[PDB]
C-alpha cells in the first residue's frame with residue numbers, strides 16, 4: 001500500500017501584526033527584522049486556539065475532496081502549542097468535524113512535526129488498513145513567545161496548514177530521513193512544566209520560548225543542509241529532478257545559504273515567512289498550500305518535491321515525494 | 324517486516340505516598356480509597372521529570388537486550404505530562420542515553436498513549452527501514468492533579484514503563500482497534516494553555532486535571548468493554564486463546580466489571596494500581612513489566628496477550644499480540 005497527498009489547505013487568524021506594529025511595543029524596527037530574517041509581518045490569533053486553526057484546515061480539506069468527517073480513518077496533528085494535553089488537539093478537531101470513525105493523536109517534534117506526522121501517517125496507510133486521513137501542523141506560537149524579548153518575539157507567528165493523505169496505486173513517497181539530536185536540546189526551548197505536589201521539590205524555570213539563535217542558525221546551514229543533500233543522494237532521484245524544496249520558514253538568509261550548500265538555485269526554494277513569520281510545524285504545509293493556490297504545484301503527480309522541517313529537539317526530517 | 328516485543332522494563336520514583344500519607348493533606352482515608360478504586364499507595368516524584376523516569380526505562384531495556392544507545396532507530400514516548408513541549412520528552416531520553424542514529428517524538432493520546440505509540444512503532448518497523456526502537460509511556464501525574472480535590476488527587480501516580488520493539492520474520496501483532504471520541508472530551512481534562520499576547524483576548528481556564536468520574540466509568544464499562552470484545556471477535560483468535568488481558572489500571576472494580584462484560588475470568592486481568600495508582604500512558608507497560616518480572620509472561624512468543632488502554636480524548640486502543 002502507498003500514500004499520496006490529494007488535498008492541501010491552510011488557515012491563519014485574520015489579525016495581521018506588521019513589524020511596524022511590533023516597533024510600537026518593543027525596541028525593534030521593520031528594517032532590522034526584514035534584513036535579518038525576511039519577515040515583514042505575521043498573523044497573531046486574537047480568539048482562536050491551535051485546534052480552532054486546525055479545524056478550519058480540516059473543513060477546507062474535506063470540502064476540496066468532496067468528503068465528510070465520517071470518511072476519515074485518522075487525524076494526526078503536529079503542534080508544540082496544543083490547546084490542552086488532554087484532550088489532544090487532534091481529538092478536538094475530530095469532535096469539531098464529526099470524524100466519528102477516526103482515531104486522533106498529536107505528535108510532538110516541534111518544527112519537524114509536520115514532516116514526522118506525514119511520515120507516521122504514511123506508515124498507517126502502508127499497512128493497507130487505513131485509507132484516508134488528515135495530517136495537520138498547527139500553532140499559536142503567539143502564546144509561547146516572551147513578548148518582552150525583542151530577539152525572539154518578532155520571529156514567530158500563528159497558523160495551520162495540512163493535507164489529506166490517501167491510499168494510492170502509486171508510490172509517491174520516494175525517500176525519508178527522520179532525525180533528532182536531544183544533546184543540543186537546550187538551544188530551542190518552550191513549555192517547561194515543573195513538578196508540583198505537596199511531595200515534590202519546588203520548581204521554577206522559564207516556560208516561554210527561548211532560543212540560542214547562532215547555534216540553531218549553524219545547525220540548519222551545516223547539519224540540516226548536509227542531511228538534505230544526503231537524502232537526495234540516497235534517494236532514486238537527483239538534485240535536478242526536484243521541482244521545489246519546501247523548507248521550514250524560519251529565516252530567508254538561511255534558505256539562501258542552504259540552497260548554496262545543497263547546490264540548487266534559490267528559485268527552487270519558495271518562501272513565505274515575509275507574510276507569516278515562522279509558524280513551526282505549520283510552516284511547510286502553509287507554504288505547500290500557497291504553492292498549490294498559485295498553480296506552482298497542481299497536485300497531479302507531475303512533480304517531485306522535497307520537504308524539510310528542522311528545529312526544536314533538535315529535530316530534522318526530510319521527505320522526497322511525487323506530488 | 325514484522326515487529327515483536329523483545330524486552331520490557333519499568334521505573335517509578337523511589338518516594339512512596341500511601342493512602343495514610345494522603346489522609347494528612349486531605350480529608351480522605353485508606354479504607355475509602357482502597358474499597359472504591361483498589362489503590363493502596365502510589366509513587367510520587369520528588370525531583371524527577373517525565374523524561375528522567377523514561378530515561379531509567381530506556382537504560383533498563385538496553386541493559387536487558389545487551390545493546391547501546393547507538394543501536395536504536397527510534398524512541399516514541401507517550402505522555403500528557405511532558406517536561407516541556409520543546410524539546411520533546413523523547414528527544415530528552417535520546418540525549419540521556421546517547422541514541423545518535425534514532426529519531427524521537429512524543430505522542431499525545433492520554434491513557435491510550437502507550438497502545439497508540441506501540442501501534443505507530445509497529446508501522447515503522449513494518450516498513451523494513453527500522454530494526455529496533457523504544458516505546459515508552461511515562462507520566463508525572465503528580466504535577467497535573469488538583470491536590471485540593473480529594474475525588475481525583477488520590478487516583479493518580481507517577482511512573483514509566485516501556486518496551487524494546489525489534490524486527491522479526493515471525494508475525495506478533497494479530498489485531499488492533501484504535502479509537503477516539505473528542506465529542507466527549509470535557510469529561511477528562513488537563514493542561515489547558517490559553518492565548519497570551521499583546522494582541523490576544525484571554526478569559527483563562529482551569530489547567531489542573533479534572534474528571535467526570537461516572538461518565539468515564541460508564542465509558543470504560545460500556546464503550547471500551549464492547550470494543551475489546553469486538554476486537555477479539557474480528558481477530559484470528561478467540562477469547563479462550565488469550566493468556567492475559569492487560570488493561571489501563573484506573574480502578575479495580577472497573578477491571579471486575581469489564582472482565583464480566585468481555586466474558587473472561589478475572590484471573591486473566593492482572594492488576595497493580597494497588598502499588599502504583601493510575602499512571603495514565605505508563606499503566607499498561609508497568610503492568611506488563613511486572614508480569615515479566617514475576618515469570619507470568621516469559622517474552623518467548625508462547626503467549627497471546629491483549630492490551631487495552633482507555634481514557635482522555637476520549638481515546639481507546641486495543642492490541643492483540645503474540646509475546
Ligand SMILES: O=C(O)C1CCN(c2ccc(-c3cc(CO)ccc3Cl)cn2)CC1
Nearest residue numbers: 036111213214216217220250251310311312
Ligand atoms: O541574524 C540575526 O540577527 C538572527 C540570527 C538568528 N536567527 C535565527 C536562527 C534560527 C532560527 C530558527 C528557528 C526555528 C524555530 O524553532 C527553527 C529553525 C531555525 Cl533555523 C531563526 N532565526 C534570527 C536572526
Ligand SMILES: O=C(O)C1CCN(c2ccc(-c3cc(CO)ccc3Cl)cn2)CC1
Nearest residue numbers: 359434536539540543573574601603633634
Ligand atoms: O467509586 C468511587 O467513589 C469513584 C468512582 C469514579 N472513579 C473513577 C472513574 C474513572 C476512572 C478512569 C480514569 C481514567 C484516567 O486515567 C481512565 C479510565 C478510567 Cl475508567 C477512574 N476512577 C474513582 C472512584
Ligand code: NA
Nearest residue numbers: 232233235237
Ligand atoms: Na540520489
Ligand code: NA
Nearest residue numbers: 555556558560
Ligand atoms: Na476472533
